[model samples]
Target chain A: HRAPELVEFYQSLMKENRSTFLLAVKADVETQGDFVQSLATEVRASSFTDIEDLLAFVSWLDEELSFLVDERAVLKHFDWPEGKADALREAAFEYQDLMKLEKQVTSFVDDPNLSCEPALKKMYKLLEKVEQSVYALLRTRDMAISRYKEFGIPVDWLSDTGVVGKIKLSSVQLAKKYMKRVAYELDSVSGSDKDPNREFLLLQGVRFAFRVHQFAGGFDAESMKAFEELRSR
Target chain B: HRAPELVEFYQSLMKRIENRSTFLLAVKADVETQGDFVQSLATEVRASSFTDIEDLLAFVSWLDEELSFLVDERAVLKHFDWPEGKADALREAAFEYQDLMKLEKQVTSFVDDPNLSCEPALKKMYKLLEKVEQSVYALLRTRDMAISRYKEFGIPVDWLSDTGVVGKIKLSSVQLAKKYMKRVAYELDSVSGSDKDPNREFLLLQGVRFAFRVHQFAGGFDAESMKAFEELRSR
Candidate 1:
């Protein structure tokens, strides 16, 4: 008897949660130009010779990424089963690379000895990469909407976070992915630089996820042997 | 043979010219207003006694007069070359302008007095006034135009060219007055009217009058207006 109540409650909660989250994110995406310009201004603040300012900027950037690229950030969780098979794969790849760069930014943010111009240039290129990848993803999302008829996506898509099959996404989806989504923990802060090789395993995990979602389970892969014994058909 | 001698002598005499007779006379009065407008601004002009045909004249005339009080004399004086032959003519011409203003008050008195029909007296004084400036313009056309020493930017091309001289004398004096009435009246009245550009119209107006006066002084004739003048004079 309570199962109906439980089902009704869960449905209402998810809907309410998505709507509230969608409103916040939709509002952000619509005015992303304003937010981007403000952050672009802060990045320029590091252009000076001062070491303290760089530290301050990187720290702020890390904090921004914690929320910006958090695992639960809507885009990472957004399933892409629409006919735009290529864009979904591309956006996932960009997000996975973006996380690696953010991991490096955290290392720099943790380091105290980073004052030289080389260090700063190194810092900016990584940030620039993140910005460029987001820009790439932004175009893909835009293409899906603009060519909605040709692509078989809905008209008036931006106004709704309406589903494409089971996947819920819209203008705010790319925005969700564009931002960093790592969660911040005050007690777990580490002083050392983040591991470089850690991204190899992380990338592999994302690749597996990407592959699994893109096709039916247990689809064919390379027939070549790690010897035929290592691969189970 | 003595008659030939008499004709030659009479030809040289300034008295033989009849710019003062009815139509030409009216042309003279009409043309008298030509010189007064140079270096004038519409804001400085004001209305006067005449009101018909292009109601802007009196408005501009009045505005021009009010402006004369505050106008920078040196500024106006600077346009004419100093210590030059034309300068003396322009100055002498300027002095005559002083007297015309005095006569203008008298003319305006009669014209403004609606009880009085001032047309004859008005045109007569207007003609007298035109003659007053002739001697000055005589100096200008010969001394100024021939030498080409002074060329104001907006003066009429016809005035500057050969075509303008022939047409000047063509219009009858009444026609001349009528023409002047339209032009100066319009120039003066355009302060806020359709002809609102005062300095532009002033320059354009000045050019037009110089065209007429040049032909008149040259004794060049426009046949059509000449016949019209003849027709009116005969009437």
Candidate 2:
């Protein structure tokens, strides 16, 4: 009896979720050019004592610049109706690499001997400027995820946690898997095999459960409060 | 008298002309990177020398590579549909370096000579290279002068195809004023109708006057409209 309703609910949820996610991503992609130029200006202004180090920095900038161009081209030519988790994930991974690269640069900057030279000093200053731009880009990424949440769309696969490790399943597959598991957990906890509002509650309750189970590390008192409130509803 | 009608007509004319001219200028600027490369290559070649036969062969071989690379660069220009008469001039400038390729063939023939007098041939080649360098510089100077004149005329430099080809000046003073008016009126209308900032509207008014002054200085406009535009400009 509930199978048909659950299936219908899931379909509508995905359709609405994808469209909301799509609009947020389009806005995010539009501002990527400004961030690219900001990073590029710093890269160009930078100097390095080691030519190889200079080349590596330039190569990284070129890769990012080209990626920005490719992303724009994709957005332009394609209808892009499906959610761009793949593209957004690609951008997220770039920021991950950026964070790693930042730490590496920070290590060099920490070394007094390495940071002493005029060239090294210049490079560090430029890296700081680049970091400012990267921070701006991160804010944009975070804002996009916030927008996705505002529209009641699950954006777990587009966040840092989603990219923390190689989770083999696609976002849709993972969402489905997580939803089913959370529903089972909810049913088991509430001891309701025949509940009218179970499917209705799944929309919000599944998200809350996933946040607690996957993100918060485990359920706690706050989680219990959320669950009991949903039960009362 | 249809003075107001003609004034409105002139404003529309200027707007269209400016837009067309602006587009032409942008097209010209796009190919300027190729021109920059040509100049840089000519500078490098001018500064280089060959010490002996082996050195000369190596140098000539390098020139072959550079010239072939330039051929590829020129090839890139062929795809662009540059504005009227402009593509031809650019193609001519791009092909200016092709003379060096032919000169390369003459120098490469030295490998066949058993008693090659490297000193005399190198001397001759160096003199001829100077000739090629001067010719290239001469063309570049002419191109630069065309750009300067276009700027002097308040025309966007990019509309020009080559040296000596001036902006099409067939339009009478009234026609020129008409051209300027169209752009001015459109721009003014844009600021006034849209919720644009006050500074833009003020600056645009000033710019319109400045454009008219330049146009009339180069001989353009009716007396009443000129006085009207000047007073508007001062505000």
Candidate 3:
């Protein structure tokens, strides 16, 4: 809020997080691709799940579609510098007719009208294909993230910050725990897996911290030391 | 004995046909360039033999049908700004080819009947066909014929056969084709000494072609003549 020293610090912080979920969103889509293929196969074999699974699939569709619609703006403002912008927009605009379908399917899947069973039964193949593509799209995010030049001083450095690291407003342990739950859920849906004690998530945490530190570049150099002497203290 | 008006008329006729050298090359040279040239162009090729008026009329009628689209499509005569009325000039042009074909029987018979002889529609159609002959047949006939003529004229070969402008002369597609026609006709003229009728060489060319056709497709045993025709045709 103050003039010279204050706003620049906060601005530096803001610049780091311009694409917070760019990675997370893509990973989940990759997982969804695998699940949709399995779901379609299950439904086709007449190996029906309960109405509960059917309803769950509906919610899955809603969440996925909503994510696509919600992320459309982020999809535009950021892009892989080497990316085919036309291709990206083609895939993006494909969700152009999103809301109406969301409302229709929402009503159909929201409650068991007479059409619910037949509708879900009919839609599994379509859903099967949709998720595969959605997952394929999700895999692109990682590649896209690799191109993100602005590494927002990530939460990774917390691992080395001392056991006192456990007692912060932005705790490294909490973020590590959250990322582990995602990877484990992913591995489980991939079938059976029990071994991951979140080493994968901790690795990512460090990866981000290193990226954030490196990319902060001259923004965090003795340049910022110039700001310290200007502070209220 | 020379009258000024007659001299002007002949000169204008020469102009009309200064490009005639363009028309003089056997249309056969460009046969392969058209769609289904075997039946159309080769059939046109065979039918081109001036064996008689009926055969000749067949080619002309074929010519008329082929060109009706181009002439009617463009107001070509109007574009050239010729001073004569359409029906009148085309009427006289209709008689010119009519007498040449010797189809007084066919012409007198159908000119009145409207079954497609030299009536207004019929006569105008040939005139239209004539303009087409003077145009596409003059310009974009074939990349092959253009190149062949370009070389014959001592025009150096280049990346293009479809266009050229050599020395003091510039050949647009139509003009290029006109030059292509001129070069080949010059060769035809060398063999045509002692005869001034340019139409005669074309007739002779058609006769040569018709003989080959007769030899090729009687729909009978004929492989040798057909084979012989094919050998010469590819040349």
Candidate 4:
């Protein structure tokens, strides 16, 4: 009924943005979900007297994951009024995948410690399959943004920054923040009288430093020596 | 083999004074050792980048371990109590003690010199340590005079029991002299109408005059008190 070219453009915009939203949801799950799983396993196997550090990691995960899940819900309930019959059917199909993705994620996160190794791997593989769809759909919003600019469409959302921003940028900021916090905590522990768990805490500090350096990359021999002393009995 | 009684007196006197000498010697040794160690560390520290956090961490650890022994030694030597009736024996023992004092001055003179150079961190730590070194020496000297000159001033050899009196002496040698000057005048006034030994009164009156002069030299000799001391001397 609408002009075919205009109908095509609207369909492309809605599906492309929907694909981008799904990509983000899948990427967010893989990145943050894996971290939650690994940290949960570490805490489970650990004899750590203070679970405060592990709890801090969970708190961050919970915040990021909750935000992602809410965004995913918005994308799942998306209306496509101008979408044709086939487009509407594809949208319904993607909705089914979102529900399955949500259920699989909930099973893992609801009780991460109770999830068996096999079930954990299976859920991870399910996310891995979901992650594959992302490869084809990556930056699909950028394509729409390109079309918008070329057609002189002055959309307000185009003026916004860091929408679908490179995840590595957020990762690096988070890594640096975590590094500073861990360094400060180690300094506090070292300032006090010797603690019985000092060696363990120091080892944890060294491990965290390695994690930071992998991302931030200002590694030095002296910094290593400084970490070594923290664990010195 | 000294005579038995003299040996006992000498032994107690030696033990009493022995700790101060040993304490100073250990302190002197620690001061020199830490001084030498810091200079070597300072060479590397100056050569190294000031921005290095590792160097700062290492320095604090090194400084804590180095100062630990000195802290313990200072705690052990804080209280002072001279055994009574050994003022004579203590004087006999004073020759070696006086010699140690001379040696102490020579040992501490290097520390007093403002020759420290380079590296603000090194300079600060050295200044901190050197001040503490000088304070212990000054405290030892103050305690020295409490046994020596103050005892001779008729402040009673036993007044050494009160460390507060020693602290007052440290504040102002004159303040200590004035405090005793008042007490001497009060003794003379209180004995005025009572049965008095002329010899004791005469001895006390002589002490009053000397104490007033000491107060004067200490920088607060009261003119009226000097007149009273002189008038009481005539009586």
Candidate 5:
């Protein structure tokens, strides 16, 4: 999709990802799987959403990593100024949020409710696919951004507009590919009539999706890419 | 000598020693020693004509060394705002001055001069002895000053002040010993029949005296001690 369409897609993905991730995390904390299927459906459908979902996701992931790295930097260099310390604290909060979501997804999948078992299974598979896709996208974006910085390319967007959208799209595309793969795997495993294995696989997929969705919140893929590239060169 | 007699004798001894030491140093510097000697004598005699010459000379010698040590301390450490840096710099200067004096005195004895010549070098032998005495006194003073700082004691005084006349007098006694040795050596060696080989010994004495005296001037002992002990430490 073009930039506008892409941006819209990312925004929708962010809204959906945030809603689903937060729901999953809360459910896990409560040890409930009542809405597992719905959350799973939402994540699966997210793959088909505008590429911006992927981009925004990646942007969020990048931001997450950057925050972590900045925190690490602050710890390593005690002499950092007050501003850096503040940034590090903010980043830590973001990371905590990301982890909370992951925990919720995990708890939901492990819930023993049989009525929503099928839905939870589907949701888990879809999440796994999305997570794999997002991770792959993050890796690539990190490489690209790193190269850009090495060439002294100005990271103008990060400054002019605090959001990085283009690279976020790439992350969405990656998540899409993952969802497609999970769908295929589910179909292939459906004929076996082995509910327990299927449940296990679905739980694994849910975990994967939860991790992938982490990148969709408050992260920056482009900046991450730039940092990685800068480091490598 | 009784206390007053001893003090007077010490003072006279110091004047002669100062004159001889200064003369020897001047000679070593390639200046005319007789002129410096005559001039120093006239000045000391003029200044203390009313007082017992010996007592005055002794007192002056004592004051000079005491003040030298105190001033040296100030020069080394108290001159700067930062005590640590000033202390380090002072320490370095002190060591440098000490080492340089040692070297200069060693070399001064070898210079060729009839006054230092030895057919019977006994006459100038006393001068050499005086130089050694001053060298030892100065070195000891430097050591003592350093010890005071290391011990975090009070500051030393460099100038001839109204108080602490006793310490001053003690220093003057050391200076007096140095002066006596130099005068005795100069008189002995300047005689017509001084022994040549013994002349070397007298020259060595003069060399030591020269080294010690030079340190008194260049080492900033008086100023350093006053500043470090009285001004900085008091603060």
Candidate 6:
């Protein structure tokens, strides 16, 4: 009875994770673009007050770029899995670390005495780079998906099994784990500025991870270990 | 140069015909339903002036239904080729007659008085039916052209080809024919009404015709006289 229930539970979790992941990727790309544009406009207006504010903005920009780079590296690793197994694993771990760093910096943006002038200008430049990088990564992913379609390799398989399996769990389980990790990390970094939206984003990432796991189907103990490590801190 | 050009021209014409016929069918269905509702509303109103309106509406409704029936019949006939060789000419001739009748109605509607109440409504109904019928026939000719897609067949062989062979035209040629027919039908229908754009509806007719023709190939043609009748029209 428990096995049946457990299987059903995992299946449902997997579906939710996959849906959330797709939503997150689309939403993040959309939201990140808006955020970068707004930040750039603010910098152009010279609205930042102090150096700390600018530095915080720079850090946030760096984190955003890291998110883009990590997402691309991870997606690419899943896409071409013939010879880059070890490299992919290493990249996944690095990506996990970057995601944690991003969680920390998102909170750092709210610091009261943060400087804003010179740092904000630098932040705008950094955000421009992130936007370019992320957009490029997204375009590459789109091209790869199109190629997959052209080749008649069902599009759903790309994000479902192999990628999901690389993380040693179902796509949904991975999403939940990633979300939980991000939530806990955010709690540790900024006790008072707990943004539920940020947590939601984390959850969505976890879900996408699970979808990739299930559809692409290459999860093993090593990858599972990496997932656990990311979740732990 | 002329051979390829003619092939291309015929293919393009066929494509437009297919698209327009399909669009016409879809629009006719929509207009029929809308007209029915309006007629029902008029009947319910029960006013003295509503009597003439009711008659006009009824005439329009009848015309839509007749047009729909003619379009559907033409679609059915053109979809499958005649089984017997003799029937091909007969079928083609029948289709040609229907086409001419539809054209007559379409032309008549252009000059008919808009405020002549029942007379105008009747003429308009006749015109729409004829327009749809002519468009449907034109599409059938394209479908005929498609049968010999691999090897060039002159316009004369359209009546000779069987449904199976006719349905097996190159996909590219089929698509081209659909686009051509669509344009023709859209232009022909839009000439009468200034308020509505009927292009989308005609395009739907082309799709339905394509699907129907394919289905005809899948299911054997039932009529023996169809091929002969088609040949007679060619003559």
Per-model DockQ against the true two-chain complex: 0.00, 0.01, 0.00, 0.00, 0.00, 0.01
Candidates in order, TM-scores: namely 0.16, 0.20, 0.19, 0.17, 0.18, 0.20
- Give the distance in Å from residue B96's predicted Cα in candidate 1 to where it truly belongs: 15
Tens digits of lDDT, candidate 1, A125-230? 5444544644554444443333232223233322223222112111122112111111111113455523442333223222322222232112122211111211
Q: Model 3 off-target regions past 4 Å?
A: A1-110, A115-126, A138-233, B1-182, B192-235
Cα lDDT tens digits, model 6, A8-123, are: 33224321354454455445444455554453343333323333343455455446546652354222211112112222233334344434433433332322243323333333
**lDDT tens digits by residue: candidate 3, A32-83:** 4455334334322321123233334445543544544234322221211112
What tens digits encode model 1's per-residue C-alpha lDDT throughout B1-235?
1233432332233122232234333333332343254334311221112223123323434444643553343322222111222222223333333443444343333232223332443345356437635633553444332222222111112332333322232233324433433443333444455635535433333424433443454444355543432322221
lDDT digits (tens) for residues B1-235 of candidate 3 = 3233432342243222334334222232232233242224323332222433344445556655664533121222211112122222222333434542332222222222233322244234334334433433333333343333233222233423222211101212122222223333344445435755554444334323333222222212133433332332221
True lDDT of residue A183, candidate 6: 44
lDDT for A21 in candidate 3 is 49
State the lDDT at A38 in candidate 3. Answer: 47
RMSD in angstroms between candidate 6 and the native structure over all alpha carbons: 34.0
Cα deviation in Å at residue B49, candidate 4?
20
TM-score for predicted model 2 compared with the true structure:
0.20
- Give candidate 1 misplaced runs (Cα > 4 Å): A1-233, B1-137, B140-174, B177-235
Worst 10 residues of 6 chain A by lDDT: A76-85
Clashes of 4: 0
List model 4's recovered fraction of native interface contacts, to 2 decimals: 0.00
lDDT of 4 by residue, B41-82 (tens): 434322332223233335445544643555343321111111
Candidate 4 — which pairs collide? none
Tell me how far the alpha carbon of residue B109 in candidate 1 is from the true structure, in angstroms, after superposition.
Answer: 19
User: Model 5 segments beyond 4 Å from truth?
Assistant: A1-153, A157-164, A218-233, B1-235
| Model 6, C-alpha of A31: deviation from truth (Å) | 58
- A98-182, model 4: which lDDT tens digit per residue? 3454444334331323423343344335434544533333423333333233222222322223211222223233333333344
